[PDB]
Amino acid sequence: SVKLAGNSSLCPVSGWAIYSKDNSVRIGSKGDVFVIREPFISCSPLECRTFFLTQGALLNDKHSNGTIKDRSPYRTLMSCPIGEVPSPYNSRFESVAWSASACHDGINWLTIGISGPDNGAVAVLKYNGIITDTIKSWRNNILRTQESECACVNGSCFTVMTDGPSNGQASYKIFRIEKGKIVKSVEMNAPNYHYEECSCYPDSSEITCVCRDNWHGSNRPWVSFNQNLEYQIGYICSGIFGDNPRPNDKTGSCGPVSSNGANGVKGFSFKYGNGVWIGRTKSISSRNGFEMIWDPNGWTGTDNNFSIKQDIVGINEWSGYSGSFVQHPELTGLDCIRPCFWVELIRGRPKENTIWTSGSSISFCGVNSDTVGWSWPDGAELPFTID
Amino acid sequence: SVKLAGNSSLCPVSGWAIYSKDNSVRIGSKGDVFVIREPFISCSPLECRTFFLTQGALLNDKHSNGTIKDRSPYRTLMSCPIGEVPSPYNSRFESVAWSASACHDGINWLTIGISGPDNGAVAVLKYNGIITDTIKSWRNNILRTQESECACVNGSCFTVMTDGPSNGQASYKIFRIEKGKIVKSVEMNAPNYHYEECSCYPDSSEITCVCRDNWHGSNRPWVSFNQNLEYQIGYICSGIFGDNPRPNDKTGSCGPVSSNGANGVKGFSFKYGNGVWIGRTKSISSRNGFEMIWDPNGWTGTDNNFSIKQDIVGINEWSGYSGSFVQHPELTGLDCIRPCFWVELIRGRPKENTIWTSGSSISFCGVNSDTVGWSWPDGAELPFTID
Amino acid sequence: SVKLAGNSSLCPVSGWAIYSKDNSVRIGSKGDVFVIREPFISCSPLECRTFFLTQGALLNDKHSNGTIKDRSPYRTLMSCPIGEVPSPYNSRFESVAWSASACHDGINWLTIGISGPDNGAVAVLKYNGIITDTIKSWRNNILRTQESECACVNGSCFTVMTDGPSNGQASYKIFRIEKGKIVKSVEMNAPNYHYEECSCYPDSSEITCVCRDNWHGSNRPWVSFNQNLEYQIGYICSGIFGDNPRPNDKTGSCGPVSSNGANGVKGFSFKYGNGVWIGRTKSISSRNGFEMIWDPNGWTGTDNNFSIKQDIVGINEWSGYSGSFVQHPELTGLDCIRPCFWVELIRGRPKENTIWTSGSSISFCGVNSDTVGWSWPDGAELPFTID
Amino acid sequence: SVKLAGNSSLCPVSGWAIYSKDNSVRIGSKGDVFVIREPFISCSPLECRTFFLTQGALLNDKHSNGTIKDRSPYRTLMSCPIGEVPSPYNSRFESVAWSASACHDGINWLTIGISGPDNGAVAVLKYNGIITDTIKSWRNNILRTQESECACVNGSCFTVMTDGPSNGQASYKIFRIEKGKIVKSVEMNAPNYHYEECSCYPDSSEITCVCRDNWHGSNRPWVSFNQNLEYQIGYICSGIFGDNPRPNDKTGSCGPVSSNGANGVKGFSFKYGNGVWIGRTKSISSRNGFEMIWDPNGWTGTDNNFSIKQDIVGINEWSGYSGSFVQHPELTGLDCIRPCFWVELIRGRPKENTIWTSGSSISFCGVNSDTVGWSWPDGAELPFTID
Numbered sequence A, B, C, D: 001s002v003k004l005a006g007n008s009s010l011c012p013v014s015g016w017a018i019y020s021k022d023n024s025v026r027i028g029s030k031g032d033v034f035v036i037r038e039p040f041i042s043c044s045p046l047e048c049r050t051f052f053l054t055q056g057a058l059l060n061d062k063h064s065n066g067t068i069k070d071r072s073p074y075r076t077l078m079s080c081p082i083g084e085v086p087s088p089y090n091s092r093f094e095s096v097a098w099s100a101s102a103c104h105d106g107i108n109w110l111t112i113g114i115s116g117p118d119n120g121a122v123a124v125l126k127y128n129g130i131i132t133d134t135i136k137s138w139r140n141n142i143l144r145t146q147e148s149e150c151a152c153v154n155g156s157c158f159t160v161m162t163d164g165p166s167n168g169q170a171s172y173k174i175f176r177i178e179k180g181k182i183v184k185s186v187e188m189n190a191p192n193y194h195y196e197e198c199s200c201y202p203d204s205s206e207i208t209c210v211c212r213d214n215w216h217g218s219n220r221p222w223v224s225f226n227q228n229l230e231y232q233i234g235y236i237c238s239g240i241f242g243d244n245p246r247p248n249d250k251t252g253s254c255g256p257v258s259s260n261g262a263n264g265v266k267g268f269s270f271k272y273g274n275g276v277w278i279g280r281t282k283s284i285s286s287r288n289g290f291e292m293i294w295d296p297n298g299w300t301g302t303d304n305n306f307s308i309k310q311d312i313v314g315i316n317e318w319s320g321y322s323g324s325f326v327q328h329p330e331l332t333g334l335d336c337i338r339p340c341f342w343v344e345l346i347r348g349r350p351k352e353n354t355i356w357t358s359g360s361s362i363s364f365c366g367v368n369s370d371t372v373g374w375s376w377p378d379g380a381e382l383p384f385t386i387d
């Protein structure tokens, strides 16, 4: 076992090849499948796993009732091999949590699971399944984290946490974690910024995060930092807005775009110089459809022109959260860090007439060979027998 | 593989971070989950597992009928990874048993499973799944043991067993077991004491057990011994009574507290000098709620003052059995033995209108970083379809 | 990996300690559990497994209909860890078979699975799951084998097969198998003998088999042989008759006891000099109850006196097939071969008003420490929802 | 780990011994079993696995509705150990796909999964679960591949793909793949030929494929090539026609037999000099029955005489697809490549009155010891509760 170097650059990619699809909701109609949301993928040098927050209940059972609710004592972080349905029969228990992150440093798994009351939540850190540290809410207002994989470089793993209002200025901290122990942290000086649910990845020994502004930005905020946590901040400038909801594409801003800026959804983007691969919903007002857009100057440029668009989920189909995950050379045998991404396909409340809310997932990995756009939707027929 | 040293002291702890929650009853509403009770956790140098006594039946099936009953030929000791639901599809078979204990010496698993008739029960000992010894009832009155993990020190594992009345003077024996073979035992000379379901842990090469007096003590009895089985006995002196049922907190006794002393529940406590971490129900009359209390002089002092209280399960929620389990430095990489504990959340009979009785579990580990009190209850909605 | 020596003697035993119980039928009321019969246990140097013949169907499903039937194209030999329920989710596939045997030589598993038509059945031999040999019916009349573990000595494994009438003189062959290849066989010269479903075990480099006479013997025939297949034959002389059905205990015979000699049940016995450990039903006319009897001169003596009787299953409870299995020193660390045995608990047709027939199992291992008699029955409530 | 040599000849075989049967449909009546079709078997140096295309749904659930449909975004390639039912609880995820192939080179698994739209499908290649290459439709008309195992020789694996009409001239390409990377391909110059769903195996360092002519051939086309992709093409000359549908046996042709030549079914054959082992349905008009025929001059001879016929599935029972798979000396310890084959037993639409279509499987391996013909059908009772 050797720790991930994380010192190579991102592999340039021309398109996205489908990597997995679990059909969780379709199968859960009869099978014993967890009610879940906020799934995400993360890989070790040996395997890739799907992490997810259960509602401590199964699909098509009465306990799935009211699962639109975000936080409860019953939610747990669990994981299974990528592409398999999240079942009590194939899932490893990770932590008790209604907000989470996880990543492998090359030696062991780090998991971060947040539970407890809204006014005093505690993040429990585990390394190889052993509790190694905790961090408690510092603003007493829903301590929350990535809902996707943390990022590791040379034995150090990094994550971002938020505490404070979801509709106004909050507090954002970056953490450096070694073998499950917080060895350093810093609060970001980001007046008028809002950071939630960051999708972070390593690139040339540094970390880049693309996050969610739930306050007043329809474009996505970003934060990048080195291992010493010296950071820079900004927003993606492209007029191809990345959040949901958002306005129709137009002239963008390198600051928060106020138009339709309230609320949002977890998302991601990959930076390549001045260019950016943007993953986003197809709808500007709802969580449906998904597409990947290559914008050669979208990181720093404000125009709404782009070069490549690839369909992932049809506009008439439900989508939801999305996030980045990477495959290190230690896993692939490549000389660069390969970008992949996952999409949560949310079914149920509030948009559908069920008693429950749950999601399935799909994932893709970046390649330079031929690819094709299509739609790989959830595919479940609602409502269910339970409703 | 190397045997556990067990020669370091207990890690001082300021609070308890949640470690696991299986949501067994909620999931068993639809999923294939064993009807169980008397669960407990125990760890090896590699993993932690949940042990439990099945009723040889599944939740929401007719064979769960009458499972309030304590003993039968159908009950079996099984185990699964911690935090996972006890299912026939993820559970390892250990032993046929209606009373049990288990622990890992660093090399292999030792399991103790008691089955047979009330008037002649036999404990079957296994080492790495192979029968290595037996011990038969010596008072012909329900031979019974810990219902939690045994304690191991330098290749020797220790447990306590009881035989005799549950409402009067009984007989109590301590055993030293090496590779599944009983190498020494001694009967405790404890007139007017009553010991049942001891929660035992190693500390500085010696064993400390906190147990249940079902006869006439509302405080908990304890027994401590070295590897040669030279022992000391007493009761926790604190006026913060630990058993259930019990009186309201008042002036305690270093002997058995007669007030509300009959009946009881399995519990635990961690000794730190004259101080004690007490886990107990919140109700004085019923098995509901759970809290952790730090009493700096509660081991030897009789007053009812304390310094710290941390909520674990709300008073309006069902609890049940609780027990200690430790994580050795061989597992954690620490220089001390870490204290953890589990709580059984009992649902069904006799307090609820069902045909069945079963439990789920939660567990916590002691830390010196920030923690928070809350309520992590079972969360199941009774009755079930079967009733 | 090293091949089993099999050159030590049987461990003398004073009683039997319960080893496993799967509660298969009770659990199958709701869980996904195979309809099975003819289960048996066999161990490697690492683990013990339960082998069984499925009916290619699950309990409480319409396809369990008519499963009283012995042979069909759907029956398969599968296995799971001992004590676990036989489910499609935890069972390894072994072979297509309606008659079978299996054993581990210390290096790999040997399985023998017989399928095909009654008039031309073929035994398929597999070593490490690879087909290594076949043997076809030589009398064109239901080629059939042990339904329990074969026996291995120094890299050679041995089994017995029968072909011919179930109600008259048939043909019996012994096989020597090395790495899945038949290297030698011999037909037993046994006029007026009848051998079926032998329970064979190694002892001091030679093999002893105790079998079933379905023709005209209420006592059990035996055959013993060395590695060169030089054999001896006879019947257990004890007036404590071992087959079912049988007469009340009286003066026995060293030849086939004709009284109630037709029909029978698979069983076993362990020989110790002139003495014998006899496992048998409690009923003389039906497959219910089970007991272990130590008869110090029962191998060669015809009287009906005995020294020890241990209850296993109550007379008012269903039993069925039973068989021997051993644990070699390579597994136990002992200096002798330990005797164990399993009992099939048959539920359903023909004695019960269901559409199906299936069994669960219990097992015990011989010890010299204290033991106790009891009843560990199937425990299922029939009929089921399907009937 | 060492790569397969693939340089030995096929093991001559006189008959076929049954190897596996999963009883998937029977078990799926109650159990949680995937709706599948197009199953196939492939082995590594360690184990054999069943690959299959799920419909992203379970048997006896509403989402099995309309599963007669060949292609959708929900279909996925998964695998489980041979002989086990394809369940979400025991199946490994491989790829998103409605057409697939897979094989092991001795070091790692190669999987090929085709998904996307009919007019622009993309094959995603994975090596050890990591995406290594893609190939996109070149005729924009349903890119499709083997639906059985690819063939590996000295670290290179080979497959055949088709793109174009199913009822006329199409385009056929052979690929050489090393560690999941396409290193060479060539389009076959085969005017008036039609190739689909090739069953390919290695023999003496070269590859032989027997395929399906869906255009105008009731006999099967073949293509053979060396590692440099230098190929030869033709049709099986035997008057014992191998496709379905087909004419009654008569005088054959070394070119496509036009009579009943339209439509077809995936099949296989093993070449031995001028002779051929032919696997085929028993019915000339429908997918029922299965038999193995040895025709000593059937590869190059046009007569309808043969030497051996072995029954596999009765004519009154449903069959379906069939394919070859081999076991290399690296797995068996033999000095030749052993031929095996599997048969898909299709149940449901369009021939049966259900809402769904699914298959189970059986498999056989070639031996030179005694064998027997019989019928090992699916055995499920339709319709099901869902219909």
Ligand SMILES: *[C@@H]1O[C@H](CO)[C@@H](O[C@@H]2O[C@H](CO)[C@@H](O[C@@H]3O[C@H](CO)[C@@H](O)[C@H](O)[C@@H]3O)[C@H](O)[C@H]2NC(C)=O)[C@H](O)[C@H]1NC(C)=O
Binding pocket: B061, B062, B063, B065, B066, B355, B386
């Ligand atoms: C679990 O066990 C309980 C108690 O045995 C079952 O409830 C009982 O159901 C039986 C059968 O329906 C009832 O027995 C009948 O009693 C009536 C008189 O009320 C008598 O006339 C009949 O001859 C028969 O004996 C019984 O009343 C009833 N007991 C109670 C307390 O309700 C229950 O059905 C079982 N549940 C499952 C899921 O198996």
Ligand SMILES: *[C@@H]1O[C@H](CO)[C@@H](O[C@@H]2O[C@H](CO)[C@@H](O[C@@H]3O[C@H](CO)[C@@H](O)[C@H](O)[C@@H]3O)[C@H](O)[C@H]2NC(C)=O)[C@H](O)[C@H]1NC(C)=O
Binding pocket: D061, D062, D063, D065, D066, D355, D386
């Ligand atoms: C699987 O799919 C089939 C076909 O869609 C389902 O059968 C169909 O069920 C629907 C809903 O009940 C029926 O639609 C209705 O048709 C009537 C006219 O007959 C119309 O007045 C209603 O407005 C409605 O459209 C439809 O008749 C029926 N089709 C057939 C061929 O029976 C079936 O229910 C599905 N099965 C499962 C388990 O989901």
Ligand SMILES: CC(=O)N[C@H]1[C@H]([C@H](O)[C@H](O)CO)OC(C(=O)O)=C[C@@H]1NC(=N)N
Binding pocket: A038, A053, A070, A071, A098, A099, A142, A143, A144, A147, A165, A166, A196, A197, A214, A264, A265
């Ligand atoms: C901690 C927590 O509750 N986080 C939220 C989250 C949150 O409400 C917003 O980002 C605003 O702050 O949004 C949503 C969402 O679907 O928008 C899911 C989350 N649910 C879970 N993580 N359980």
Ligand SMILES: CC(=O)N[C@H]1[C@H]([C@H](O)[C@H](O)CO)OC(C(=O)O)=C[C@@H]1NC(=N)N
Binding pocket: B038, B053, B070, B071, B098, B099, B142, B143, B144, B147, B165, B166, B196, B197, B214, B264, B265
């Ligand atoms: C062997 C046995 O039956 N032990 C008991 C136990 C016992 O009744 C008391 O401690 C009094 O002696 O109490 C209880 C109880 O929930 O209070 C559960 C146990 N159930 C099981 N261990 N199966």
Ligand SMILES: CC(=O)N[C@H]1[C@H]([C@H](O)[C@H](O)CO)OC(C(=O)O)=C[C@@H]1NC(=N)N
Binding pocket: C038, C053, C070, C071, C098, C099, C142, C143, C144, C147, C165, C166, C196, C197, C214, C264, C265
């Ligand atoms: C090959 C086969 O059918 N063997 C039989 C067996 C047999 O009928 C007798 O011993 C008489 O020959 O008896 C019985 C039995 O329950 O008595 C179960 C078996 N069923 C299975 N092995 N499948």
Ligand SMILES: CC(=O)N[C@H]1[C@H]([C@H](O)[C@H](O)CO)OC(C(=O)O)=C[C@@H]1NC(=N)N
Binding pocket: D038, D053, D070, D071, D098, D099, D142, D143, D144, D147, D165, D166, D196, D197, D214, D264, D265
């Ligand atoms: C890609 C695809 O759809 N291939 C087909 C296939 C095809 O229609 C013919 O060979 C004609 O081209 O036939 C059949 C069939 O059962 O005949 C099943 C396949 N289904 C799946 N592979 N999913």
Ligand SMILES: *[C@@H]1O[C@H](CO)[C@@H](O)[C@H](O)[C@H]1NC(C)=O
Binding pocket: A005, A007, A008
């Ligand atoms: C990246 O890290 C690896 C492992 O330490 C090292 O060998 C290599 O020199 C580094 N690459 C660069 C470009 O610095």
Ligand SMILES: *[C@@H]1O[C@H](CO)[C@@H](O)[C@H](O)[C@H]1NC(C)=O
Binding pocket: A062, A065, A066, A355
């Ligand atoms: C869901 O919760 C509501 C309480 O708001 C309750 O009324 C309803 O019965 C529940 N539904 C189910 C199916 O349990």
Ligand SMILES: *[C@@H]1O[C@H](CO)[C@@H](O)[C@H](O)[C@H]1NC(C)=O
Binding pocket: B005, B007, B008
């Ligand atoms: C505890 O045991 C270890 C291992 O034998 C030994 O090295 C060490 O000295 C002991 N620790 C103390 C504090 O005595």
Ligand SMILES: *[C@@H]1O[C@H](CO)[C@@H](O)[C@H](O)[C@H]1NC(C)=O
Binding pocket: C005, C007, C008
């Ligand atoms: C039994 O076999 C073992 C392993 O070969 C050998 O060492 C030993 O000498 C044998 N024991 C006897 C009593 O022959």
Ligand SMILES: *[C@@H]1O[C@H](CO)[C@@H](O)[C@H](O)[C@H]1NC(C)=O
Binding pocket: C062, C065, C066, C355
């Ligand atoms: C069982 O088989 C019989 C045929 O003998 C049939 O009549 C009956 O319907 C079947 N029962 C079930 C539940 O399928």
Ligand SMILES: *[C@@H]1O[C@H](CO)[C@@H](O)[C@H](O)[C@H]1NC(C)=O
Binding pocket: D005, D007, D008
């Ligand atoms: C086949 O390959 C093996 C491994 O490279 C080689 O040793 C052997 O010579 C080859 N066999 C033949 C018959 O050429």
Ligand SMILES: [Ca+2]
Binding pocket: none
């Ligand atoms: Ca079920």
Ligand SMILES: [Ca+2]
Binding pocket: A212, A213, A214, A215, A216, A217, A218, A219, A243, A244, A245, A260, A261, A262, A263, A264, A265
């Ligand atoms: Ca926003």
Ligand SMILES: [Ca+2]
Binding pocket: A238, A295, A296, A297, A298, A301, A303, A304, A305, A306
């Ligand atoms: Ca642009």
Ligand SMILES: [Ca+2]
Binding pocket: B212, B213, B214, B215, B216, B217, B218, B219, B243, B244, B245, B260, B261, B262, B263, B264, B265
């Ligand atoms: Ca008490």
